[PDB]
Nucleic acid binder design. Structure first.
Length: 534
RNA sequence: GAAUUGACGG
């Protein structure tokens, strides 16, 4: 890295800043500058300063020069990818490649570039799989081979509200032979190396990504998963099942088996259910790591026999799970009960009994789940009633949202409890970003109209303030849609009083328009006639 | 629109 090389890439960088360069000329300069890297790919790409310029060049050049850079750097690509700066250079090369996925003329030239990369990785993959930087490069490479260009937290694999909502029940072809080739290369180690891969954070993350990209590819999943579990008809031998069970409380492995259970084909799921989990459900549910594996197991159960086993092992202990901070386990059991149509009423009753012991407690099932952590962390639970001002409990509210997807037959204690909360509590619930989802699930449930109406009426006087927030505005429209003319008019006039402020809100203009607040203000008789025709 | 209780970068 002589100073002339340094001056060159710095001068290229300033030239792009000064935005005096046409986008077509910019693209050609990017290509010329890449040629200045030939023979020095590793040195340029891993330089703490020049790597950032090399990212700019890769993202601004044309396909041919990108491919030329990838081909000339392939023999050092694992070294670039495991470097703390070079790994961003490597990822820029992939994002750049990915911008051409929609161009059918580019198919074979992209595939050749991926082959250069996969070939040198497959030759020696295990340290790159476990390297904190190279693991990000492998995840992106796997996505590209699948034809996925657009980043997804799920695939990489972060937690997200789409995934939580999915767990609770609320396309380019790619380069399939390159995906198979690379992922087979990552998995052709000894069973004893694989044991360590199960438990290394960074390699577990790579395998999580690969499993998600193979979703619904049963023939590949049935080859891949047994290698990862060290099983290679699919059968888990008794000693291997013990080893999988023993590793289940590990933070890295627990994340991996979460994904395995999500993508597992039916026959493979059933074998895992029976041989690994079947008599350990509660012990695994109380572990800080394993309980998320149990949530994934619960969510993907196939049939009523499995539902019964999970019921027998876990419902008697619902109170333990809530006390110990494992509400996600209960949420999942409740959610899959409504999905498999099994043990619905047994699940709902076990939840009531877990929160409300004596008969007098049961009218408080709703407040206690809205503030699940305050009630269970309470000093004196026989006097606890509310958490004034507190933020409501995400998972307690998600449980309730599942509860209100049951038929009214199974959830009468929940409907009676919610609809009988006093106005101040119902109002605080609607103003909470989680509690508003509870209200909305109840308005969408098949509870009686009279009962919905009772709750909505206790919101009178607060629709204006409710509407001034993004979450409340949805609740206001859900209440409105559920109302007769008398209450639609009540809500409409409350929004009128706050119409100035409401219009300065993100959602306000839409809400004002959907409810037709201007018509109501200016020609109320015609607004009432159009609403009545609904 | 609130998004679990246990991980990730120059």
């Amino acid at each position: 890295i002589d100073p002339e090389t340094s001056k060159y890439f710095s001068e290229i960088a300033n030239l792009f800043d000064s935005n005096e360069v046409e986008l077509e000329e910019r693209s050609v300069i990017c290509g010329n500058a890449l040629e200045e890297t030939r023979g020095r790919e590793y040195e340029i790409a891993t330089d703490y300063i020049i790597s950032h310029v090399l990212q700019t060049l890769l993202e601004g050049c044309e396909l041919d020069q990108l491919c030329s850079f990838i081909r000339n750097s392939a023999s050092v690509f694992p070294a670039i990818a495991m470097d703390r700066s070079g790994s961003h250079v490597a990822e820029s090369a992939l994002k750049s490649l990915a911008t051409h996925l929609e161009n059918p003329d580019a198919y074979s030239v992209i595939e050749e570039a991926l082959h250069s990369i996969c070939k040198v990785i497959v030759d020696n993959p295990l340290d790159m799989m476990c390297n904190c930087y190279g693991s990000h490069v492998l995840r992106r490479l796997l996505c590209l081979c699948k034809g996925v260009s657009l980043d997804s937290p799920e695939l990489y694999g972060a937690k997200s509200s789409k995934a939580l909502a999915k767990r609770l029940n609320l396309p380019h072809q790619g380069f399939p032979g390159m995906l198979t080739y690379l992922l087979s290369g990552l998995l052709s180690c000894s069973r004893e190396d694989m044991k360590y891969l199960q438990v290394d954070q960074y390699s577990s993350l790579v395998l999580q990504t690969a499993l998600r990209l193979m979703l619904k590819q049963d023939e590949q999943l049935l080859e891949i998963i047994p290698l990862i579990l060290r099983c290679n008809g699919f059968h888990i031998e008794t000693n291997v099942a013990k080893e999988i069970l023993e590793s289940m409380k590990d933070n890295s492995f627990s994340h991996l088996v979460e994904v395995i259970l999500e993508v597992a084909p039916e026959s493979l799921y059933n074998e895992m259910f029976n041989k690994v989990f079947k008599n350990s459900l509660f012990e695994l549910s109380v572990d800080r790591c394993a309980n998320f594996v149990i949530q994934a197991l619960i969510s993907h159960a196939r049939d009523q026999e499995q539902m019964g086993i999970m019921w027998e092992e876990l419902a008697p202990r619902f109170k333990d799970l809530l006390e110990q901070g494992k509400s996600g386990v209960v949420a999942s059991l409740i959610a899959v009960s409504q999905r498999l149509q099994s043990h619905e009423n047994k699940c709902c009753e076990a939840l009531v009994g877990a929160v409300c012991s004596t008969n007098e407690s049961r009218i408080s099932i709703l407040p206690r789940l809205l503030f699940l952590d305050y009630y269970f962390g309470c000093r004196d639970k026989s006097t606890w009633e509310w958490a004034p001002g507190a933020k409501m409990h995400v998972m307690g509210c998600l449980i309730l949202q599942g509860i209100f997807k049951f038929s009214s037959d199974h959830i009468q204690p929940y409907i009676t409890s919610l609809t009988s909360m006093k106005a101040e509590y119902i109002t605080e619930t609607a103003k909470d970003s989680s509690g508003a989802r509870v209200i909305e699930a109840f308005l969408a449930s098949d509870a009686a109209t009279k009962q919905k109406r009772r709750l909505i009426i206790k919101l009178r006087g607060h629709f204006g303030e409710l509407s001034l927030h993004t979450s409340g505005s949805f609740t206001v429209e859900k209440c409105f849609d559920a109302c007769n003319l008398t209450l639609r008019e009540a809500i409409a006039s409350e929004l009128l009083d706050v119409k100035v402020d409401l219009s300065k809100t993100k959602q306000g203009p839409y809400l004002l328009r959907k409810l037709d607040i201007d018509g109501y203000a200016s020609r109320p008789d015609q607004w009432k006639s159009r609403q009545e025709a609904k």
